[PDB]
RNA sequence: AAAUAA
């Protein structure tokens, strides 16, 4: 499109569940009451939102949602991940995104403690 | 206070460390995900944290913040143990702890797995 | 079995 108009992007981030079998990334993607993930979507001017199977803290409620069919849980089906979303001219819009993927590594390895 | 005006009560419960040697009851307590604690003050309308000296998995992070200082870390020097609190009007509130109080006792029995 | 939930 035109290199002005502002445009949307998108990129689903796979939350690594395979590789840290039982580790709890949601809680350390939001950290206490989402100031982690609010402060990094501030951090990088994107947004942000954690989607997909496990998703939600329970698995019947995510169940339920996720057979009722509606558009909004296809989510659901799909594998754990964090969509990364930015409205800008093309130029900021890849750039800030190619920032926002830079400083999302941290919250998708462990915690050891 | 007043009857209808909201309180707050506390009731430390202590855990049998000395009667079950070695027995985890942190995990026994929080379960998977920390759910079948969080579960258990839905039921009872209650909210519980484990406090005192082994509530934490690393004895010697513990020991650390226990010499720090701090006043949020006062309970790492005294017995381990649910501290178990509610914030209602005095009828409910009470009512709560007792619930709560007998809905504990099963997890102060090791599992014997 | 380890508590962060936007």
Chains 1, 2 share one sequence.
Do not use: C, W
Request: cysteine-free; charged content about 30%; proline content about 5%.
């Amino acid at each position: 499109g035109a290199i002005n108009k502002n445009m949307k992007l998108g990129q689903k981030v796979l939350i690594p569940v395979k590789q840290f079998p039982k580790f709890n990334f949601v809680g350390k993607l939001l950290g206490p009451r989402g100031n982690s993930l609010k402060r990094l979507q501030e951090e990088t001017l994107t947004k942000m939102s954690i989607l997909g199977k496990g998703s939600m803290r329970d698995k019947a409620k995510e169940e339920e949602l996720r057979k009722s069919g509606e558009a909004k849980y296809f989510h659901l089906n799909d594998d754990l991940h964090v969509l990364i979303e930015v409205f800008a001219p093309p130029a900021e819009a890849y750039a800030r995104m190619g920032h926002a993927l830079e400083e999302i590594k941290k919250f998708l390895i462990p915690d050891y403690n």
